[PDB]
Amino acid sequence: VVLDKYGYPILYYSKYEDVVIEWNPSVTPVQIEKNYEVKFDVRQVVEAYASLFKSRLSKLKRILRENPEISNVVDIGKLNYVSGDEEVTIIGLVNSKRETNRGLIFEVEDKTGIVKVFLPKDSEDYREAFKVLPDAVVAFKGFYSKKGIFFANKFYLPDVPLYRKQKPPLEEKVYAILISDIHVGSREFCEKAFLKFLEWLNGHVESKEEEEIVSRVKYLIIAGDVVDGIGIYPGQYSDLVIPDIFDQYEALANLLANVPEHITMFIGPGNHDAARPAIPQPEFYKEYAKPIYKLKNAIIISNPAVIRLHGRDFLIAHGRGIEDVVSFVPGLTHHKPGLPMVELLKMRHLAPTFGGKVPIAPDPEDLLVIEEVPDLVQMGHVHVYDAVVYRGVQLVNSATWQAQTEFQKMVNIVPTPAKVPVVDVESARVVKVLDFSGWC
Ligand SMILES: Nc1ncnc2c1ncn2[C@H]1C[C@H](O)[C@@H](COP(=O)(O)O)O1
Ligand SMILES: [Ca+2]
Ligand SMILES: [Ca+2]
Ligand SMILES: [Fe+3]
Ligand SMILES: [Zn+2]
Numbered sequence: 001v002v003l004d005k006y007g008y009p010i011l012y013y014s015k016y017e018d019v020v021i022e023w024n025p026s027v028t029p030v031q032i033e034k035n036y037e038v039k040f041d042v043r044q045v046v047e048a049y050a051s052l053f054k055s056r057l058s059k060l061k062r063i064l065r066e067n068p069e070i071s072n073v074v075d076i077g078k079l080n081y082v083s084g085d086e087e088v089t090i091i092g093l094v095n096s097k098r099e100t101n102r103g104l105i106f107e108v109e110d111k112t113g114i115v116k117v118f119l120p121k122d123s124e125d126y127r128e129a130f131k132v133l134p135d136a137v138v139a140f141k142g143f144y145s146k147k148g149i150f151f152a153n154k155f156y157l158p159d160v161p162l163y164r165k166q167k168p169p170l171e172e173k174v175y176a177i178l179i180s181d182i183h184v185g186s187r188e189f190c191e192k193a194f195l196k197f198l199e200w201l202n203g204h205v206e207s208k209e210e211e212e213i214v215s216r217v218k219y220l221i222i223a224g225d226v227v228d229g230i231g232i233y234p235g236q237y238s239d240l241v242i243p244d245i246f247d248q249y250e251a252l253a254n255l256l257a258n259v260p261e262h263i264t265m266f267i268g269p270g271n272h273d274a275a276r277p278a279i280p281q282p283e284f285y286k287e288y289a290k291p292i293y294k295l296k297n298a299i300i301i302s303n304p305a306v307i308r309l310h311g312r313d314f315l316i317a318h319g320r321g322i323e324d325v326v327s328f329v330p331g332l333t334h335h336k337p338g339l340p341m342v343e344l345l346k347m348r349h350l351a352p353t354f355g356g357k358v359p360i361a362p363d364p365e366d367l368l369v370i371e372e373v374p375d376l377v378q379m380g381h382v383h384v385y386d387a388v389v390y391r392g393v394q395l396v397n398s399a400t401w402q403a404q405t406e407f408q409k410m411v412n413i414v415p416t417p418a419k420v421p422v423v424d425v426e427s428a429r430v431v432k433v434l435d436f437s438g439w440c
Contacts, residue, residue, distance in 0.1 A: 002231045008274070008285070009231035012243040016254040019195070024203030029262050030215045032172045036264060038299065039313060040306035042282045048362035053093060053135075056349070056366040057111065060137030061091045063158040063348050063371075070139055070156060077112030079144045089141045090115065090150065094134045104129055108140065108150070117142075117150040125155035131343060132157065133328050136352040158348035160373050160391045167375075169426060170310050175216045176423040177201070177263075178430075180223035180318075180380025181400035183272065184252040185242035188403040189228070193418040193439035198258045200434065213422060213432070219309055220263050223380040223398055224270025224318035226252055226292070232272050239405055245274055245288045253291030256298065265298040266307055270318045270380060278359035279320055279351060280304060280367045304350055304367070306374065312428045315374035317350050319381030319397065324353035334413065338388035341379060341395040345370065375428035383408075383415035387430040394429050396421050403440055 003011045064070055074088045082088060095114065096107040104126070106117040117140050119129050132138060132155075142152035179197075183189050203214050227248040228240060242248050259265055267284075269275035274288035281303040286293060293300055301307065304317040325340035326333050332340050344350055348370040351358050360368070376394040383400035399419045408415065418436035423429065 008288070010245045010288070011230060012237045013241050015242070015247055015251040019254055019258060021195075021198050021202050021258040023260055027203030027205075027211055027215060029260075030172060032174050032216065032218060034218055034264060035310045036219065037308040038301060038305060039308040040304075042280045042302035042305070042367055045365065045367070051364045052360075052362055052366050054111070055364065056135075056369060057091075057093055057137055059366060059369040059371060060158050060348060064091055064137070064139050064156060067156065067159070075112040076108065076110040076115045079113070079115055079150065080146060082144055084143055084146055087141060087143060089139055090117075091137065091139045094132060094136050094138055097132070097134050099130075106140075108138070115150050116148055117152050119152045119155060123153060123155065128157060128346075129155040131329050131332075133324055133343070133347065133352045135354050136347045136349060157346045159346055160348075160393055162391055164373065164392060167311055167426075173216050174218050174310060174425045175213055176219040176221060176309060176314070176425050177217055178221050178223070178378050178396060178398040178421045178423060179401070180378075180398040181225040181270065181383055181402055182222070182252065183225055183228040183400065183402035184255070185228035185240055185248040186402055186405065187239050187241045188405050189241075190401050190403055190417050190436070190440045193436040194255065194401050196439050197418070197420065197434070197436050198255065200436075201263065202258070202260055218263060219425070220259060220265045221307065221314065221316055221378060221398075222265065222267045223316050223378050224268055224303060225272040225380060225400075226267060226270065227273060228402075229272035229274070233407060235407065239407070249274070249289050250291045253295060256292065256295055259297060261297055263297060265295065266301045266305070266316065267292055267298055268301045268303045268305055268316055268318065270303070271320065275303070276361070278361040279318075280361065280363070281318075306372070310425050312376070312425055313372065313374040314376045314378060314428070315370065316378050319379035320358045321349075321351035321353075322379060322382050322397075324351055324356055324358060327356070328353060334382050334384050336386055337379070337382045337384055337397040338386035338395055341377060341386075341397065342388060342390045345377060345390055345393060345395060376423065383413060383417075385416045385419040385421070385433065387421060389429070394423075396423075396430050
């Protein structure tokens with residue numbers, strides 16, 4: 001039985017009040033000038049979705065037009081004022097996508113019209129056109145039939161540039177720790193493993209290599225589902241140790257209070273959190289999430305957000321779009337979220353698909369478009385660790401601190417709890433993975 005305070009689900013044990021972890025005096029932290037900036041946050045800004053699709057198309061059409069190979073772009077509404085002798089390019093939203101034994105049928109829409117696009121079974125760009133999600137913005141080079149079909153010979157994705165200038169080296173080596181899906185309130189939360197991680201952060205390490213990493217750790221990024229929430233799915237009460245949203249954030253803040261002062265924490269919301277029930281999520285609902293807003297070394301970031309650390313862009317998102325990829329693309333699955341993450345980077349959109357349990361807000365501007373090329377992309381949500389480099393960009397899933405729940409077992413989700421990516425800010429790369437799973 002769920003309860004509501006002003007409409008929001010609030011309720012239906014210890015809150016880590018006693019938890020005190022002090023810094024190891026034996027370890028001295030390397031004095032590095034903290035260079036950080038929130039480069040992008042959601043808060044820095046008839047048909048309900050008309051303005052959203054206009055924004056999405058405009059933004060991604062700009063990214064496509066930056067490809068030197070894309071030329072002779074013509075409006076879809078002008079396609080039969082064009083003779084069948086002229087090779088043209090069209091840019092538009094993938095409204096529908098259907099496979100025949102003879103190829104792929106797309107319904108592509110721009111601001112001037114809609115057109116049926118045919119791509120033959122094995123045009124060298126087929127593998128990519130077969131993977132593209134609907135409501136993504138793409139380009140097609142080909143000829144118009146005058147029967148009503150665009151006979152494409154080339155398919156283009158917004159992509160990431162193959163060539164980008166290398167960044168100048170930093171004065172000192174600095175590390176960033178990536179975590180997500182803590183799920184405080186859940187009986188499956190790896191409480192001991194997380195306490196051992198807080199000890200590790202406070203210089204309580206047993207090797208010289210770990211000691212030189214901990215001394216240089218200045219940033220901690222938390223990519224959503226920081227609490228397990230209330231009324232997220234039917235039967236959730238059977239899994240909750242802390243069945244109160246206020247007490248969940250209070251328990252979380254008591255743990256996160258034990259994070260060293262020399263570490264700057266960047267905390268973003270997820271789908272279990274007390275935040276907007278659609279994406280993008282500006283921040284957390286301050287009425288419920290207040291204890292984390294009061295942490296001295298914490299910065300509440302939006303979902304999504306772009307954090308510039310020492311000149312390196314870290315795009316932080318919860319990971320709702322990974323689900324869109326695994327449902328729509330056969331062959332791509334969890335146990336490896338790295339490849340689905342690459343597809344989102346290539347589409348330059350975090351969650352293009354509409355209709356899923358993925359609620360996309362009918363906002364005036366599309367803030368889910370990856371407008372600028374990041375150095376690192378961090379996502380959570382799927383509860384499985386992975387890391388893959390695509391054209392100099394590091395794609396990484398920060399896993400979870402939650403062991404397999406009753407519900408996860410039923411929907412066949414197998415997590416990899418307590419696997420922590422260690423990022424070298426200079427190269428914006430995962431250099432090590434801390435494994436605290438022995439404590440699960
Ligand atoms: N209803 C449902 N069916 C199937 N798969 C699901 C469902 N809800 C979540 N998930 C998956 C998505 C992630 O891989 C994992 C953790 O999501 P999180 O929501 O953070 O617990 O569970
Ligand atoms: Ca030793
Ligand atoms: Ca059973
Ligand atoms: Fe989660
Ligand atoms: Zn989630």
